[PDB]
Design a protein around this ligand. Structure first.
Ligand code: SF4
Ligand code: SF4
Ligand code: FES
Ligand SMILES: [K+]
Ligand SMILES: [Zn+2]
Lengths: 114, 688, 207, 125, 48, 95, 86
């Protein structure tokens, strides 16, 4: 189990890079809303950022964490430099997707998907 | 010890004596070309496509027929070999018709493919071709005999596997023709297999004709439910539709054959289907409704009845997942009247011991038996592939076969002792001469058909047969590992039901007529509204409208075996699972989900939301039901025999007569085959 | 010289074989395999640690002088534990010759960036990262190059579906292009084309 | 300098797959059965991984087969059962493995067709 | 065609049509195949 | 021939016709249902059977290499005609 | 709230099920004679931990591990179920 690292020697160093990324995203949301003229609030933007970090909270491999951070920085740079358009920033909120209830009976009525 | 060393292209390989050159090449992963050779048929050696050079031998040898000699070097890729293949392919194609665009074999044709890999890329034949008249051999196999390459596979299969000496060759020379000479129909329960083994488009499936091409089909490996053998099959589909059924090789079950009902009844899946939930309107007629409305009317009744006022009957094609879901739902209203249509005597051990209702010798074990006693069964139509296995042992191991019952044609000669059930007592008591045969046998097999157990004296017959098997093992001569007692089932859902503790037969429902009845795919007509109180609330879950649906108050459309991943246990006790080939039609739903959904509406939610979880529940009731493809031994035949003596019951005077006596009774046995238009053609063919 | 058969060139086969073992003699620390195909193409298979030493040697050595990076790409082979094969195709103008250098990595192991050796490798490594998700260490500017902004996944992996997971349309309510789960009016029809008869005995694997 | 990482390989969060198509799918790892229409065995060499079939429906305009399952055509090839299982584990797919089916070795004998006293004597050639 | 007349067939259009898009004679696509699954029809009498 | 359903919709040569109550026929309102009028099943029946003096005849559809692959047809059964499997032309053996 | 069904799982060859195998060999016949109408489902399966399952009214189930029990211990585990109903 001797593997070449990416950036972090262990989870302690990786969680430091995670916190650094979270700060960068957290500071950036106010500019993103302003620059892209989004009709959402800074609170919704930061709640969405928080929701994106939370879904990955269960990782324990430092290499996987490093790659998630690398992608997070790539995503942040795309946003800061306005390489993304408003459509890309808003794809995180899936505003046109209809609710898909997640209880057995609701799925049973609509189709065969488990 | 006696293995000899041979070389394939210089690579040494050790092979048993008697191994052919073709089999030696197989060991190094080289497949010699062939057309007439089939590993399950007798060696023919007439196509000559297998000709292969032996180093230092000036003559190429037929690899399929030539035994290897020590030190032989087989040159599978020499110019001498390659030129032999090119010459034979050139002769094969000289008179073959330019039919590929209109021929159903196109795209999965051994002649096409081997011409590509081993033949030349052009023709030098400047003559006119032979043309042959086609011959009508029934509604299942279309013959375009100008495509025939005279390989004789069909003749050998019909003679050896199917036990029908109807096909042959007439004439001689270039005019030699395969056929029946006279106008005859090849209507055997295994006839459709000759479509598979014919290498060319000479023999093709009539129902399948022109509908698809091989490259565009999706193959779903699944299990057959048309009987209790559990033959492995491939469900071919395209663009959301089932196109045909193919065999799937399983050495220990169906080898590479399927019965004709398995092969051609799938067209019943496109007819009489239940596609929407139905309820009775205010005029008393069934009308389409939503799932919400239909389940609520069922849940309301379920919430108002308890104990013996609620019963269920499972039909023949029901999967284990639905069976356990239905049992759990009814148990939660304190009901235990979970019944099957197929009877099994409950006297003594009943269903307590698996060995009491299993084919304990297993299908592959038939090949090791030296005597077989068939009691009150017609395996030819009840389990065609099992009967094919018996004929295989009759042919190759000189198996002795005797039958107590009606003198049906089994495709192999057997000793017919009679049809009186009293003969079972004589054999046991030693009076009968066949008693000496059973004593002198090292590996005797006693097979009792589940059909015989449908008589009113089934318990007495099972007690009588178990007595014979008991005495055989007490007397010794048979080793302890060998199993002598067997039950041959004919229903796909029977063994799973008995493994789960369902009550076999509807006797319980007859003693205490319920107020609410669940008909889980139950179309045998074993319980009608004459047997129930005038106000009975009957719910029918199933996939076909046949017998159960028209008498129902609520119809819940379920999935057919091709439309769900579901568990079935064959007559050996071997659990296997189907795979979804297509989804259920319309508003139909997976069967176990319907029961799980109903349990929630009735505030009795079963504790499993996924297919994986309901299979965990199966493991908690019978741990063998999740051991897929494994045959789990069952023991304690001694205890079962001990309990089968406690109560004596009379044997009736009625002779043992199977439900199916001729082929016409074979085609329509379940709801799917009864809705098959192809099966109706077969019945018409064999009765007019 | 049969008219339909491609002619052999044994002189090129001999020259490339000799140079193959020349490279193996000089860089034994990194070279794992050297082979020459029947149509005269030389491949050096190396340990991934040797990307920079090996590529520098082939560029700068007086008997090699592979100055041009013709192509840099990756291949995905899911059955291997190191599923990604990294392939460098180099050209030598001085000796009018080509060479292929191959190494490997998995989803989580970085490969050293070859931009120091070949400035051409910059965009090629961005494409490999984009289409395969292989990370290149010390790349001056690693980011997607071909996929859409914010695109999730690496399409050229064998387990990425042909049509992906999302599709775009214009929505009048939000007055913008939106991304939604992919639905196809006509599903792509998978064909099973392979013949069940072996074609090339010369390549048969042992059983 | 190398590092030690003893946890199991789990790349489900850096492959970009939607969560529905990780945790609700069922991979089948098997060796394809021989097509019974042909004798060639060349398509029974490698292990395959496929996913569970999902709904196809008729397109209202044309009647074509529509699907919403992105994995409906995904089939991967593996040299060995262990390779396929390892790939399924790291991607987070639950799976079933079906053991390889190899044809039984048979005893063939041209001579048996003409037996003096056995049932293998053939009545026709 | 005054010199090299085309070959006559009984199915060739006698009257040529120009592009009919955007008119009531335009082509409308539809599935040319019949219904695949036949549904069970319940009986028309109350026997239950 | 092209029939009409009791709703008036024409029936194609493949037997297709939207049934009484199928919403999908709204696509034809204000427009038309394209239906080829020359039914090939009726046209091929119009052809006369050809009388030949040999047990086996060959057909290539006519036109040489503009036809279909050449096939040979057996004319030994007198109860029926041999039919070309490609073009549908019919042959019979005179006495 | 009575007893509805008993299931006994065991392995045909593991040493952990030896006591359960002995109990079935010696005492199952007499046990069934005392409870003719009680389903006692014996289900052998390779390499399973032996367990005694008991189903009560309204689908309440409890299970008792029989791993390494002697035949005498199996008789008590069953006696507690057949008597201490619940
Ligand atoms: S049998 Fe094979 S070669 Fe002959 S016409 Fe049919 S597809 Fe072509
Ligand atoms: S019909 Fe088919 S199987 Fe029978 S001899 Fe001819 S080619 Fe062989
Ligand atoms: S396969 Fe050997 S002669 Fe036909
Ligand atoms: K065929
Ligand atoms: Zn023609």
């Amino acid at each position: 189990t001797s593997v070449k690292p990416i950036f972090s020697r262990d989870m302690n160093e990786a969680k430091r890079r995670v916190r650094e990324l979270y700060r960068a995203w957290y500071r950036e949301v106010p500019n993103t809303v302003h620059l892209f003229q989004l009709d959402i609030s800074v609170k919704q933007g930061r709640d969405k950022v928080r929701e994106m970090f939370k879904k990955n909270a269960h990782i324990t491999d430092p290499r996987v964490v490093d790659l998630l951070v690398i992608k997070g920085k790539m995503e942040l740079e795309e946003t800061i430099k306005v390489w993304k358009q408003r459509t890309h920033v808003m794809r995180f909120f899936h505003e046109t997707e209809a609710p898909r209830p997640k209880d057995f009976l609701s799925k049973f009525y609509v189709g065969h998907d488990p | 010890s006696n293995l000899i060393e041979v070389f394939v292209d210089g690579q040494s390989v050790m092979v048993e004596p008697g191994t052919t050159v073709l089999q030696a090449c197989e060991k190094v992963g080289m497949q010699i070309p062939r057309f007439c050779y089939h590993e399950r048929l007798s060696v023919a050696g007439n196509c000559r496509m297998c000709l292969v050079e032996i180093e230092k031998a000036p003559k190429v040898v037929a690899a399929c027929a030539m035994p290897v000699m020590k030190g032989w070097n087989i040159l599978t890729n020499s110019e001498k070999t390659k030129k032999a293949r090119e010459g034979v392919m050139e002769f094969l194609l000289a008179n073959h018709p330019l039919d590929c665009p209109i021929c159903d074999q196109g795209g999965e044709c051994d002649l096409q493919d081997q011409s590509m890999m081993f033949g030349s890329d052009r023709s030098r034949f400047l003559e006119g071709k032979r043309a042959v008249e086609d011959k009508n051999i029934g509604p299942l196999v279309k013959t375009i005999m100008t495509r025939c390459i005279q390989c004789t596979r069909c003749i050998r299969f019909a003679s050896e596997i199917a036990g029908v000496d109807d096909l042959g060759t007439t004439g001689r020379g270039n005019d030699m023709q395969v056929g029946t000479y006279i106008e005859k129909m090849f209507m055997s329960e295994l006839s459709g297999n000759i479509i598979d083994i014919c290498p060319v488009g000479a023999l093709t499936s009539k129902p399948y004709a022109f509908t698809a091409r091989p490259w565009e089909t999706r193959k779903t490996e699944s299990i057959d439910v048309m009987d209790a053998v559990g033959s492995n099959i491939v469900v071919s589909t395209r663009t959301g539709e089932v196109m045909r059924i193919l065999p799937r090789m399983h050495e220990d079950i169906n080898e590479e054959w399927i019965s004709d009902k398995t092969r051609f009844a799938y067209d019943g899946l496109k007819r009489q289907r239940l596609t929407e939930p139905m309820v009775r309107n205010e005029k008393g007629l069934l009308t389409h409704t939503t799932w919400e409305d239909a389940l609520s009317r069922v849940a309301g009744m379920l919430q108002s009845f308890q104990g013996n006022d609620v019963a269920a009957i499972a039909g023949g094609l029901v999967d284990a997942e639905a069976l356990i879901a239905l049992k759990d739902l009814l148990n939660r209203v304190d009901s235990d009247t979970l019944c099957t249509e197929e009877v099994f005597p409950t006297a003594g051990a009943g269903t307590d011991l698996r060995s009491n209702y299993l084919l304990n010798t297993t299908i592959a074990g038939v090949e090791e038996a030296d005597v077989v006693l068939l009691v009150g069964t017609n395996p030819r139509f009840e389990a065609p592939l099992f009967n094919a296995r018996i004929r295989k042992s009759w042919l190759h191991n000189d198996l002795k076969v005797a039958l107590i019952g009606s003198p049906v044609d089994l495709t192999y000669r057997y000793d017919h002792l009679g049809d009186s059930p009293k003969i079972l007592q004589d054999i046991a008591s030693g009076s009968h001469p066949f008693s000496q045969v059973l004593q002198e046998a090292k590996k005797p097999m006693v097979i009792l058909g589940s059909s015989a157990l449908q008589r009113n004296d089934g318990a007495a017959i099972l007690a009588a047969v178990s007595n014979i098997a008991q005495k055989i093992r007490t007397s010794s001569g048979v080793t302890g590992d060998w199993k002598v007692m067997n039950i041959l089932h004919r229903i796909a859902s029977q063994v799973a039901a008995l493994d789960l503790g369902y009550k076999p037969g509807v006797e319980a429902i007859q003693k205490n007529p319920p107020k609410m009845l669940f008909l889980l795919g139950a179309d045998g007509g074993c319980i009608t509204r004459q047997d129930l109180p005038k106000d009975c609330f009957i719910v029918y879950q199933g996939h076909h409208g046949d017998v159960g649906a028209p008498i129902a108050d609520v119809i819940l459309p379920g999935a057919a075996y091709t439309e769900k991943s579901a568990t079935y246990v064959n007559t050996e006790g071997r659990a296997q699972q189907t795979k979804v080939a297509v989804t259920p039609p319309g508003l139909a739903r997976e069967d176990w989900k319907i029961i799980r959904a109903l349990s929630e509406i009735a505030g009795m939610t079963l504790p499993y939301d996924t297919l994986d979880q309901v299979r965990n529940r199966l493991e908690e009731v019978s741990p063998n039901l999740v051991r897929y493809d494994d045959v789990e031994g069952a023991n304690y035949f001694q205890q079962a025999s001990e309990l089968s003596k406690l109560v004596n019951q009379q044997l009736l005077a009625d002779p043992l007569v199977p439900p199916q006596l001729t082929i016409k009774d074979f085609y329509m046995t379940d709801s799917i085959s009864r809705a098959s238009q192809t099966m109706a053609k077969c019945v018409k063919a064999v009765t007019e | 010289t049969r008219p339909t058969v491609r002619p052999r060139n044994d002189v090129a086969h001999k020259q490339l074989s000799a140079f193959g073992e020349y490279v193996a003699e000089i860089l034994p620390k990194y070279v794992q395999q050297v082979q020459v195909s029947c149509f005269n193409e030389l491949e050096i298979c190396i340990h991934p640690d040797g990307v920079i030493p090996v590529l520098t040697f082939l560029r700068d050595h007086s008997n090699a002088q592979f100055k041009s990076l013709a192509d840099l790409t990756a291949v995905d082979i899911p059955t291997r534990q190191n599923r990604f094969e990294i392939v460098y195709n180099l050209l030598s103008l001085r000796f009018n010759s080509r060479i292929r250098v191959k190494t490997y990595t998995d989803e989580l192991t970085p490969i050293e960036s070859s931009v120091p050796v070949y400035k051409a490798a910059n965009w090629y490594e961005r494409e490999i990262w984009d289409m395969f998700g292989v990370f290149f260490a010390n790349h001056p500017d690693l980011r997607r190059i071909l996929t859409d902004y914010g695109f999730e996944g690496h399409p050229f992996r064998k387990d990425f579906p042909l049509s992906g997971y999302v599709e775009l349309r214009y929505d009048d309510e939000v007055k913008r292009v939106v991304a939604e789960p992919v639905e196809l009016a006509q599903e792509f029809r998978k064909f099973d084309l392979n013949s069940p008869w072996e074609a090339f005995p010369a390549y048969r694997q042992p059983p | 300098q190398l590092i030690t990482v003893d946890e199991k390989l789990d790349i489900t969060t850096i492959t970009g797959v939607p969560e529905e198509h990780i945790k609700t799918r069922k991979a089948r790892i098997f060796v394809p059965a021989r097509n019974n229409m042909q004798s060639g065995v060349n398509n029974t060499k490698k292990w395959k991984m496929e996913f569970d079939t999902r709904e196809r429906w008729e397109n209202p305009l044309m009647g074509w087969a529509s699907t919403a399952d992105p994995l409906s055509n995904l089939v991967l090839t593996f040299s060995t059962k262990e390779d396929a299982v390892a790939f399924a584990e790291k991607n987070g797919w639950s799976y079933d493995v079906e053991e390889r089916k190899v044809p039984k070795p048979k005893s063939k004998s041209y001579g048996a067709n003409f037996s003096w006293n056995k049932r293998t004597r053939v009545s026709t050639k | 065609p005054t010199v090299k007349p085309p070959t006559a067939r009984k199915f060739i259009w006698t009257n040529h049509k120009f592009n009919l898009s955007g008119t009531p004679q335009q082509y409308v696509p539809y599935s040319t195949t019949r219904k695949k699954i036949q549904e069970w029809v319940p009986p028309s009498t109350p026997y239950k | 021939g092209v029939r009409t359903s009791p709703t008036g919709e024409k029936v194609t040569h493949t037997g297709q016709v939207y049934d009484d109550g199928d919403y999908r026929k709204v696509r034809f309102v204000g427009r038309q249902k394209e239906v080829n009028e020359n039914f090939a099943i009726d046209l091929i029946a119009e052809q006369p059977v050809s009388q030949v003096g040999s047990r086996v005849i060959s057909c290539d559809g006519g036109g040489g290499a503009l036809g279909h692959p050449r096939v040979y047809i057996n004319l030994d059964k007198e109860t029926k005609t041999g039919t070309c499997g490609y073009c549908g032309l019919q042959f019979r053996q005179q006495h | 709230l009575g007893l509805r069904e008993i299931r006994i799982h065991l392995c045909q060859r593991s040493p952990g099920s030896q006591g359960v195998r002995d109990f079935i060999e010696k005492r199952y016949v007499e046990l069934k004679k005392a409870n003719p109408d009680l389903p006692i489902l014996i289900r052998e399966c390779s390499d399973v931990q032996p367990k005694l399952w008991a189903r009560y009214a309204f689908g309440q189930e409890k299970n008792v591990s029989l791993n390494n029990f002697s035949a005498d211990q199996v008789t008590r585990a069953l006696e507690n179920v057949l008597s201490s109903k619940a």
